[model samples]
Target: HMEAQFFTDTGQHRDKNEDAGGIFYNQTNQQLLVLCDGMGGHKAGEVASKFVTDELKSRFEAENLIEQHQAENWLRNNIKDINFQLYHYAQENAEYKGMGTTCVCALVFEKSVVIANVGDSRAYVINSRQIEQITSDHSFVNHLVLTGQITPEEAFTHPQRNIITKVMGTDKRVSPDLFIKRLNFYDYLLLNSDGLTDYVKDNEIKRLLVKEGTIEDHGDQLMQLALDNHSKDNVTFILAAIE
Candidate 1:
């Protein structure tokens, strides 16, 4: 069986935490990890993040899989539903105007795993030799890098670096990027918001994961590293060590 844990920090700047995460399971032994980073004025961001977590938990506990046979499609469809709900609700209320969030999830089974993500939040697979990013950020700067408009280094310091192109609840509909991979023994799965990823490099994260520590301990180490790097947003993560 695989083990999982969730962690989040408000960091040095943000007073109200707009990040949310959770680990869930079903009777059939399937497990789920969901994480979100919210964006809005006042307390709306926190609410949007919490709603994603609560909505995902409800779907898992009720076994409300959107597709019957495959984990990837199921998660994608359910996430789309939640996105629409949030988007529509925000349109109906003046207070929640322009509310949205970044969301990502990993579904772990006995042999393989399915992952889905939207916006900038990321998922990574830490293997023995290297740490590989599993999800791509749907951000403006990423597009620039992909199209060769700028180098990765340039994207990092770009004036519009924070402009994300896709996210949950911003539009009338949303679709998550999905990936499937067979689990490897001694692998570590990392699900985190842009907070941890924005400051810490992939190599740095890999180094911490390979060090002697529990999942929670490694998560602690990562959070500290982000703070040390002057990460301005909440440092949030869900670190899982596959045994």
Candidate 2:
């Protein structure tokens, strides 16, 4: 079994929250975690982000079982299909052009997991002892760090930290980075939009998760930390732990 929770909050500066996320289970109780951070004007960002979450939830539930071996391909194909749909939708509408979203998702099977993502939304695996980020950000700052143009610490406050190199819907084609890992009973998986990460550091995040609390308490505390730090974007996250 799995214990899970989802949360979202519009922070201080955003007029509308373009972030969305969810925790879902299928007929056999296989779990799917999703989070998206939309970027655009005219409220199109809201649609782009929500569309990814809704489509993934529906598709995951419709499947009787997504075999462990085939999980990666299943997520890739579905993400590709959603990217196509959004790209064409934007091409046909002038106002929605350039609208896109960062997405992070995980498919949890009994003893294994498949993770996929595009752009900067992230996934992390945590236990009482440690927290580890599972997905890499497809953002310009990350690229800079990889190439040694900046240090990891500097990337956090870089002026162009918001500039992502890839995302869903902005282009006709997109490929998600995929990862597979074995699960442990003590593990907790977290999927979150940049809204929280942008304002809160990973060490602080780990500290909060280390504290004793229900899943909901941990989630609420995390969101409150982001707001207290004055996050300018929308905050959203999904947390799940295996039992």
Candidate 3:
């Protein structure tokens, strides 16, 4: 199997770092990428997000996901398991009563990629000059836009835009949207928090992906663009390219 490389960055917008997330490897046959947007007051949000990321990393390392079809089930079941554990922990602990996070994870294998997400965090695929969003936001504003109650432009300024409909640790049952894409040598995957997409338009993101440069160059440009656009949220993202 060929080795995988990953690049990640996090931004600061909240008074404290409520967003906690990261990406890492599996000991066996796969590479795991995860990002979590923490919520709730105090530091409980940070703890919850980090806890879930760690738990998922450990459990995923114990599974074999190199084979086809198995990666999808493995990722889905692991997300469900993490959701249950976080929910139970909140129920049992007073301090963490409402602690939760929006999580999106991707499992990259030799032949395919499997993604699972809840809430607004997103995943995208960049091929040549086209950048396609692979995940949907589970937020109220997104629902409004989807149902034609509001326009896509209206969603950007909606006061309830950040109000999420689902999240890990917030409810007893959580269902994540799952996506699978066949791998190609030139494909690139991007897993990002709402911060990046909230300020960077899809067309701008596509342009950045298509520009001839290194991942570091693109990452810096993307982050700078969000900051320059006055994005108030923390901008976090991971860039993964297939070789």
Candidate 4:
């Protein structure tokens, strides 16, 4: 029942940082931790991410509700609410047309972790010497892979790799990939935008997560590694340790 320590850094490639993210500890239920990533064009992306975060904070506070099994449904519902607001705003303002964002959220409670994702941002569970990706990218490349049209590695470098098939605010209805996994004290949770994963390999991430020291230290090291590797996109991440 403690606030998860958080450290985030925006990458250098973006002129006016559109990526917005944060971690929140629900006051009504101390064990819950939430992380949100927002994407859009210009300042709209920042606005969308911030708005979604604030909306969830308000809802969680008002309801003061906690359900282990329904966490994914809660996230989907909140996402719908955000989409409606964004879509309505876009309809009223021509300048904001087509503004939307990919969202990935996670709720951590006492016994398990619930994750929901739209678009390509990801979530992973690191334990001992292994790393497992919990959420899949909802991009065109992923679609091709699922249809047996491309190999997994080819999908990584596919021309349409960045083309997301689903995103919040772009459509009235969206379905996120939802997952719930049992927790273990030795496990570490990672939620990050494509900025990091696009350039960094899964094996490399596994190695970095297993490196010694505190979560903050490791998180900073990971960001530096991504920058050093010349990631052309904005990089942002969240690392949580279970005690």
Strongest candidate by TM-score? 2
For 1-243, candidate 4 gives per-residue lDDT tens digits of: 423555555666666455656666555664434444455343377666666667766777665656777787887788777778877776677766677777777877777788878888888888767888988888898899999999989977788787788787766777777889776754688888888888899889888878677887888888899999898776777788866
Tens digit of per-residue lDDT, candidate 2, span 1-243:
368898999887888889887888788888888899998443389889988889999998898877789899999999999999988998888978878898998888788779999999998888777878989999999999999999988987899888899899988899899999777745678889988888899888889987888899998999999999998888999877666
Find the 10 residues in a row with the least total lDDT in model 2: 39-48
Error of 3 at 81 (Å): 1.1
Model with the higher lDDT, candidate 2 or 3: 2
Clashing pairs in 3: none
Q: List clash counts for every candidate, in order.
A: 0, 0, 0, 0
Q: Relative to the true structure, how large is the alpha-carbon lDDT of every model? A: 0.84, 0.87, 0.78, 0.74
Better TM-score candidate (1, 4): 1
Question: Model 1: how far is 152 from its true place, Å?
Answer: 0.5
> Which candidate would rank higher by TM-score, 2 or 4?
2
lDDT of 4 at 99: 72
**CA lDDT, candidate 2, residue 61:** 87
Q: Model 2 has how many clashing residue pairs?
A: 0
The reply for model 3, stretches above 4 Å from the true place, is 1-12, 40-43, 64-66
Q: Write the per-residue lDDT of candidate 3 for residues 1-243, one digit (tens) a residue.
A: 323333333454566555666666666645788888887433488778787888987886776444656767877788888899999998899988888888998877676778899989898888786777889899899899989999999998888788888899977788889998766744678888887888889888878778787777787888888888877776778887666
Q: Given candidate 1, what's the lDDT at residue 7?
A: 86
